[PDB]
């Protein structure tokens with residue numbers, strides 16, 4: 001079965017597309033090597049089409065069926081509810097793509113009669129029709145990256161496939177509660193989206209320590225979405241159906257599976273038929289849950305086929321990392337080969353071949369790695385970090401261009417304890433916010449696929465709640481981390497850390513001068529910049545924050561708003 005079939009109609013833009021890094025008066029203070037930063041556009045959609053287009057074959061053995069039966073057994077304990085039209089509407093992002101039927105995201109959120117009436121008609125159609133393929137729009141994503149080295153210089157735009165707004169609201173009603181609760185029940189501690197950064201680090205560290213002679217590896221599946229077959233998607237449906245559901249929800253899920261999830265026609269922004277899809281749609285509510293369940297199912301069975309010892313997996317959609325009991329460096333390499341052969345038979349061939357790791361800090365999963373620093377008391381502290389190249393390239397772009405998603409904010413929140421997020425991102429962006437008097441302006445960012453509207457002034461409390469106060473006093477980072485950051489800066493032409501420490505003292509002083517929440521930011525976020533630090537005590541508002549739903553499930557491409 002081919003993942004896609006094309007007509008020849010091009011994947012078209014729905015607006016003007018920029019590829020070169022936009023420059024303004026603030027750009028050079030952050031990055032000088034402008035030519036190293038770019039954004040993907042529809043101009044490379046052709047290259048992407050070739051990569052994601054291929055034949056899929058599956059050979060399912062008993063290990064596969066054994067694991068699936070166990071997953072279904074846990075899924076049977078789940079009771080999920082249907083969401084009312086209003087609840088589904090409120091989960092819709094204010095700037096979600098408008099419907100082709102006379103209404104947009106705001107009309108949905110406002111529960112306008114027109115939107116609500118059309119939504120009900122789509123719902124009724126799903127119940128009456130369980131066969132007609134539902135239309136979807138295919139677009140080229142505009143994402144920012146840094147060039148080099150030998151991966152062709154620049155990577156092609158990724159593709160996004162999504163159904164109409166009316167259908168998206170319907171998915172929420174029938175499956176929001178399911179995709180939010182089922183994964184954790186089925187996979188337990190292996191479900192990665194239930195963890196905050198600190199909790200993820202804790203699980204990785206404790207899992208690593210639970211093995212006599214730990215060995216670990218990340219498994220990179222080549223174009224995971226395209227490796228997902230009709231079988232996989234139907235098996236996913238069988239798992240959802242194991243839940244205790246309202247009869248109406250069962251019909252809608254069966255309908256969505258047959259008409260949308262398994263595949264359907266692809267239409268470009270101009271209304272032309274681009275082809276047909278027979279693999280995972282990247283822009284549906286079940287994309288994250290489906291990829292997670294399927295990755296976990298195939299990997300769990302593969303672990304058995306490979307006979308890995310005391311296996312512990314951590315799955316986030318298509319991102320997989322396994323930690324197990326080492327049986328010698330020789331058998332470890334052989335085991336991974338068997339694991340890989342098993343995954344392949346299941347249709348999930350690897351991109352980069354997997355390799356055994358015997359140093360937890362060298363394993364990258366979800367683009368991150370565990371590292372260590374020290375708190376005020378001098379105690380060793382494990383935290384999550386990553387190479388800052390992409391985060392910095394995106395920050396440069398957002399420095400001169402307002403975007404729907406502010407990656408710099410998401411990165412500060414998730415990587416608040418890191419050297420680079422603290423010295424560069426915080427310093428740079430708070431400087432910009434100060435100068436524009438926009439510290440109180442709520443900005444959107446995405447965490448685990450979901451959209452959140454966050455006020456920068458609330459960062460101190462948010463960071464305390466997610467990482468603890470230690471995020472404001474970590475010091476003495478590892479040489480490896482320091483060197484990776486410093487190297488990254490030289491590559492992009494970003495001023496050295498010493499410059500940022502100097503700038504931070506200024507930003508800090510400026511914030512303190514504003515008093516109120518602004519002062520709190522200067523105090524907590526930049527205490528690392530002064531030689532004579534302070535005490536930094538718990539923030540009252542911190543415990544007042546409603547951080548519910550922040551780290552429960554993944555919703556990548558799920559069109560979810562959690563504010």
Ligand SMILES: CC(C)CCn1c(=O)c(C2=NS(=O)(=O)c3ccccc3N2)c(O)c2ccccc21
Pocket residue numbers: 195196197200288316317318319366367368384410411414415446447448449450554555556
């Ligand atoms: C594992 C995290 C603690 C650290 C890395 N990290 C992520 O993995 C993700 C993330 N969200 S997602 O649903 O698209 C997704 C889908 C499938 C596999 C991984 C992710 N990963 C972030 O959206 C993110 C945003 C800001 C900063 C860091 C971040």
